[model samples]
Target: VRPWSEFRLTPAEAAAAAALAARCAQRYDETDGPEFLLDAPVIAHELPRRLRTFMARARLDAWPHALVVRGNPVDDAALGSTPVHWRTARTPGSRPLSFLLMLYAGLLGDVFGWATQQDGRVVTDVLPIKGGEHTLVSSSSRQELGWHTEDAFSPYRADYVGLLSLRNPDGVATTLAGVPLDDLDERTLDVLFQERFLIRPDDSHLQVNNSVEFEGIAQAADRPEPVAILTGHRAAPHLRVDGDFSAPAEGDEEAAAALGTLRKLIDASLYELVLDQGDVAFIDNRRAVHGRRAFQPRYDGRDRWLKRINITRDLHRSRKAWAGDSRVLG
Candidate 1:
């Protein structure tokens, strides 16, 4: 009934997929392990053939907002209690799921992560940190994580952001909204397509989150460059802007008005999708902006946690920013 294209795995299909993941977990270390990066897509090539076809063909020209797959098995008893912080969140229960996420990511594109976030681990954790409950990053629980393209400040932002929910008994909703084109005027749309906006890196990439230094942090945080928020075919342009970090270029009142109007339009058009246990969603970064709704946090062992990975269509496009031959970007 929703705009997102939904697919369900039959019990047989789900079992086959999980078994395949187990086999990979046996041979590879974690999803972010160096050996896995060189070979995950090769192992993933053995995934259910039909699923590969669906991933490769769907979402051409970025039409849909998200692609949701359900019925994957996630056992809480096996996953254990969610840790109190992201550092200790990686439990044996969550290890196999990480491999599965990389496999799914391999099907879509080349997986990569920021050296500035979570210590450059390609497979990162997303659990509520006790003290960071109100921040703008993914770990926030009290305040909504503002909607944004994966990394709007960089030309190297992800083409797709994949998340796998291991447990969510409380049913927290992830918020999403695409460009409200129908409600926008031609002048505003014209202004949005121009390169007259500044987008800085979100606080998640700052030293407070990881403390490790990286090349672009100072430039991306203190002095952001200008870029267009929308591009490509006039009728269906690709989206790129951080709701919390975007600003109009100096002295561009028309662009400012367009951006302000855009914020209002997107807020009104927002919709929710909950990723329950046994579900995964591949959010189209080029098509929509996404965030989460605020909810009370449970410091207990049962807090909502998900494994996330980023994908790009072409790794070579970001070769200049790559740290050696690894799958991480800085």
Candidate 2:
């Protein structure tokens, strides 16, 4: 049985939701427009009630690592061939569905993005890029995206990470794992709950991924402060660790031991959840770490592709990183 919550929309409901998204595309300049960003929650009221209800209630579930919504229609032809790179992706063919993802994300929480990731776009594209197949970021096809909390280095990381599959002809599986509470010992748990971990920002925030460099990201990469891997209540503590970027602070061997144990337990417990074309999943970032399994890239314009966005329960939580009136976090 699947551990996450799922709701499959009827054919009628799917069409209705798609039509609403298309209408939104016609009305709004783009999903990231300031006006649209501010109005998306209200505009999302037009989506089918069943879906709205599912998003509203499923997000409150304490056990589920992700909330999955299946059966959002995606015409392969209408979507056109997958872009060679995310920098060239914002094509007209895939515009409506981007709006769809933003609408659904708005229903969940305040949508935001990173200044140093994907050129500060709120709705970022995720497709395999040629020559980047073995890199550590999301665009890498040959490399397995190591499971980690989204934006683990930041105190104001997302509450949830929303992904909408535009196309996945290969049925690539996305991996996810919650904290391995069943195997954790008191000593290790206590250590993880303390500020003994160093989590640097992932490579996706590097200058190579953007048109211009960002100073804040450079500072974060150079001087990441110590932080706890586990926070909140002990029974169900929140998670924050990047498999590729996290490490024990200083020469704390005990902390290193704790981190090693955590890695083993999480790797053992990690499971796959494939999001087929037209499927949308909202992963609770605090409760789960997610990644993609290694797969060969088709690069033939039909490679696995997805639209991703970050959401926070409150916009004010990241005010310290905010750049003027923009929603993109620095």
Candidate 3:
């Protein structure tokens, strides 16, 4: 229910913020390697403090289940350091170093901890739209991405999802919609919260016919067992359902159908918006399901470029999960 103006920062303020980010980046560079840039104690401590104040002044208690911020400036060197691999999005003129740095340090660092690969070089531009079979997929293909949570198949799920836009193709509007579990009826909630469902990584996560395996589930080593859509504490349920990545358990056709019905309800009840350049959006990973609408991609020079970062605060709880690499997942 928040408007773009609610979270907007002035250009001068943004520039000042970028300058502060550059200083933080310089300080972070003094200690560890590139991978540890985000995990450094110096960053972890300073970021949350700054972000809380920012959120307060903006009158935003917590970020929207899905939120977007636009029209900010970016820094070159900071963007270069990001672990992105897309050639088109990473081109000299396309990358926004300052934007990416603030994205991770200011917004994401204060809220949650976890980032995704915006490596456009290896993956398609992740346009949800259909058509344009002959051209390389860019962000402009405004097709519908089914409601899903990020990393639905993983044993450990993310606490937040962050997307920072470097460019918006032809002023394309990428819509993100969410479904809150609290809104569901008692019967539907029982089925989603109590049922164990089979889940797998999205097709995007798997290589072409790579044949990866899941631990407990037997039918397909690539598939994992039935997990409940809602878990965690009773007062605050954490969500874990991505219609695209999750399926019903064996002989649970009726239950699966019910889940689909729930998804439909969410789609019908969404708060939609288009994210513009210098805009950053953050979602509550465990409480909502998110997806993007289609946009037309020209790929001439200004295709939509969104930098994604995932984060979590329970790093200590999952010490064995990260191993030596602070930047990568276990």
Candidate 4:
């Protein structure tokens, strides 16, 4: 059985959905427009009945690591070339698809963005960039993006991370792994459930990744508080660990050993999930850690590209990080 739930839309359904998103583009003109953001969930009610039902029910299912909807139809010629950098990725050709992604995300939860990432755009682009092939951020091509809970360092991290693939000619796999519950011993489990580990913000939050500076991110990079690697139910605990950015609290040998054991268990259980063009998946951030596998970039404007957004069940939970009245958090 698949670790994630999947629903492939019929051709007619996919066409209708694309038509609806196109109409949204005509009226809203921008996916992140305040008016559109406020109304997207209501608009999503017009989506195909079967799709809507799947979104409504799949979210409550406790077993799946993600809810994937496939067959959304993306045109290469119409989509134009991939942007060299995320700062310039929001082109007119890809505007309607962005709206489509926002609508899908709205069905799940409140969508938000990081002020410290991609210049605070509610919808962001993920693709390889020249000279960044070895970096730790999403744009890196040659190096694999290590598995991690999105924004694992924050208490207000996303409950879901939505990704819609515009193109993936090579079909590079996205890696995922759930908590290794069956393998953990009592002592390691006890230590993991306690607040004894530290998770630092990923390189994507650094100022260099953004077009402008964000004081909040700079501060977060310097100070990471101790938090539990796992929380909630004992039988099905919520995971909160970053493969590359997590560590045991200073001088805690037991915590360190538990973390080491947890790492090996997670590595052993990792699996792949590939999203072909027009495929969309909303990863349950609390249930899984996701990363991208290393791949060669064409740099010929036809490389892999995906649109991504972050979603939380509640917006008020992160009020401390909100800047002014915008949905972007620091």
TM-score of each: 0.97, 0.98, 0.73, 0.98
Show where candidate 3 strays beyond 4 Å: 1-6, 22-51, 56-63, 67-71, 74-142, 180-183, 208-221, 232-236
Q: Among all windows of ten consecutive residues in candidate 1, which has the lowest summed lDDT?
A: 211-220
True lDDT of residue 175, candidate 3: 43
| Cα lDDT computed for each candidate against the true fold | 0.87, 0.91, 0.51, 0.91
Give the per-residue lDDT digits (tens) of candidate 3, residues 180-205.
54567767767777755777665543
| Model 2 worst lDDT run, 10 consecutive residues | 208-217
Judging by lDDT, tell me the better candidate of 1 and 2: 2
Worst 10 residues of 3 by lDDT: 115-124
lDDT of 1 by residue, 1-330 (tens): 676877788888888889988888888767787888889888888888777777777756357899888989988889899988778777788888888888888888899988888888888889899888889899999999989988888898899899899988899999999988889888888999999999998888887788324657787777777789889876877899889999999999989999999999999999999999979999999889999999899888899998888899999999888866548887
User: Which TM-score value belongs to model 3?
Assistant: 0.73
Which regions of candidate 1 deviate over 4 angstroms? 211-215
